[PDB]
Design an enzyme around this catalytic site. Structure first.
Site, short mmCIF file in Angstrom:
data_model
loop_
_atom_site.label_atom_id
_atom_site.label_comp_id
_atom_site.label_asym_id
_atom_site.label_seq_id
_atom_site.Cartn_x
_atom_site.Cartn_y
_atom_site.Cartn_z
N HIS A 108 -0.91 0.46 4.63
CA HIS A 108 -1.20 1.45 5.65
C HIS A 108 -1.69 2.79 5.08
O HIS A 108 -2.56 3.43 5.67
CB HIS A 108 -0.01 1.61 6.60
CG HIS A 108 0.26 0.38 7.41
ND1 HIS A 108 1.45 -0.29 7.37
CD2 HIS A 108 -0.54 -0.31 8.25
CE1 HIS A 108 1.39 -1.34 8.17
NE2 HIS A 108 0.19 -1.38 8.72
N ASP A 157 -7.76 -2.38 11.92
CA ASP A 157 -6.55 -2.95 11.33
C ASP A 157 -6.29 -4.31 11.99
O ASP A 157 -5.26 -4.53 12.61
CB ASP A 157 -5.37 -2.00 11.58
CG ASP A 157 -4.07 -2.47 10.94
OD1 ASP A 157 -4.09 -3.24 9.96
OD2 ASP A 157 -2.96 -2.09 11.36
#
Lengths: 271, 269
Positions: free
Chosen positions: A59, A156
């Protein structure tokens, strides 16, 4: 043990304490494991999404390089990110609004209940109580055709339409100027054909395209990331003062030049 | 499937067709597997030494950064390297001599018969026929001999990571000189990497660290560099680099060699 097998029989393995959940959703098989040494593992169709002890290794490099390269990112779109880690990182920055568009509601539900890396963020978005983050359940491909005006767009998603030229043209049109798009782009060594083809399509559309890699824990290492730029952003430079304010354990903005590590044969093929 | 397990229950796995070799030498258990998609795998005490399809991802970053950082590397020592990959890479450069010191002769024999990443080099060295490369059998710590421009430790994981060893290495280096060692898994052998860096800092004039994605190992893998005299390891000879055949290490992007997770960089400082 849990193993994810990749092309040519390479495997990423974790010793496990217990399998603790499984559901076939409308879009994929969702599974959660308690691992021995890496916390909980979320898998979708048997592919590792994250381990709770190590997920920041994904992340952080996904989000912060692009956010720091942009001169003032205020409106951000996240496609996918059902686990909430990406939006959590985006909110380290002083944005005005982050929209998240995830196709599979069950990934959000499983993550908020059993994974919990989002720290209450997913619940706030589901209840519409969050001051900056808003959630749409839907297809990111359709959403970007009909919605626009973003400084940063972060894909993502799971493994590969989100890597098609059609999609990248919609993304470019939806970006502000200046604007930056970034996507996870697969295992450097094992999804190499998919990385090269994605780069090829992006190069047709964006003003600049960059590649980088990072050692993501739980994935076949290293993982590739691709960036598309609209307008005049030098992605090899970041805002160092904004970078110092971030809480980071993996991505090292003070050594930003090292982000661009990539095996030579792949560098050559892309160029 | 072959799996090598690491601390905290992380595993590197390969689907295999068959195990084709197993012998207990005087030093360790040598095994060779045929993998489905990565060629042959050589293991010592269950730890992966290499897979033949991908081994350049280790041997290139081990050898070439130090060889290109040194102004004129003419005499090189390789400790370990029984598979021949390391010496093969050193010989891409115009060296006068490269000595390889490997404790376990059985690794050389199995490598030359079953692995064959060395392209006849091991055979030439065993018969004293190679004009540049010399093989000796013995312990690298024990190996007495000095005057080397580059010393490369291509051995097993963290005697070769002790302060005492590093003083003998420093005395055995020319000025200018350079030492480089593989230093274990960045994520999974982290304490061992930090403590090796600490010992090297007590001896060398400058110590550098980097990482590289090695195929077959828990990735990424760490490397440590100790320097004697006037070598800036952040700079390499670009012109010499362009003449090498490389698939993995990218000397024209030498600054990216130094990728390292932030928390590990901070601990090392």
């Amino acid at each position: 043990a849990f193993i994810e097998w990749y092309p040519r029989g390479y495997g990423v393995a974790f010793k496990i304490k217990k399998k603790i959940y499984e559901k076939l959703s409308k879009y994929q098989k969702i599974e959660v494991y308690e691992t021995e040494g890496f916390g909980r593992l979320l898998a979708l169709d048997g592919t590792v999404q994250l381990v709770t002890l190590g997920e920041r290794s994904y992340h952080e490099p996904l989000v912060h390089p692009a956010m720091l390269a942009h001169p003032k990112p205020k409106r951000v779109l996240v496609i996918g990110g059902g686990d909430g880690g990406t939006v959590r990182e985006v909110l380290q920055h002083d944005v005005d609004e982050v929209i998240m568009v995830e196709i599979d509601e069950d990934v959000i539900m499983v993550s908020k209940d059993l994974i919990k890396i989002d720290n209450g963020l997913l619940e706030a978005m589901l209840n519409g109580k969050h001051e900056k983050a808003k959630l749409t359940i839907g297809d990111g491909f359709e959403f970007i055709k009909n919605n626009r005006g973003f400084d940063v767009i972060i894909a993502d998603s799971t493994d590969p339409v989100l890597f098609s030229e059609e999609f990248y043209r919609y993304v470019y049109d939806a970006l502000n100027n200046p604007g930056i798009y970034v996507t996870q782009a697969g295992s450097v060594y094992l999804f190499t054909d998919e990385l090269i083809s994605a780069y090829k399509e992006m190069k047709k559309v964006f003003d600049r395209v960059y590649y980088y890699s990072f050692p993501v824990i739980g994935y076949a290492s290293p993982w590739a990331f691709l960036v598309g730029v609209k307008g005049d952003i030098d992605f090899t430079k970041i805002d160092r003062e904004r970078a110092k304010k971030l809480q980071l354990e993996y991505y090292d903005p003070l050594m930003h030049e090292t982000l661009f590590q990539m095996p030579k044969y792949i560098r050559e093929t892309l160029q």
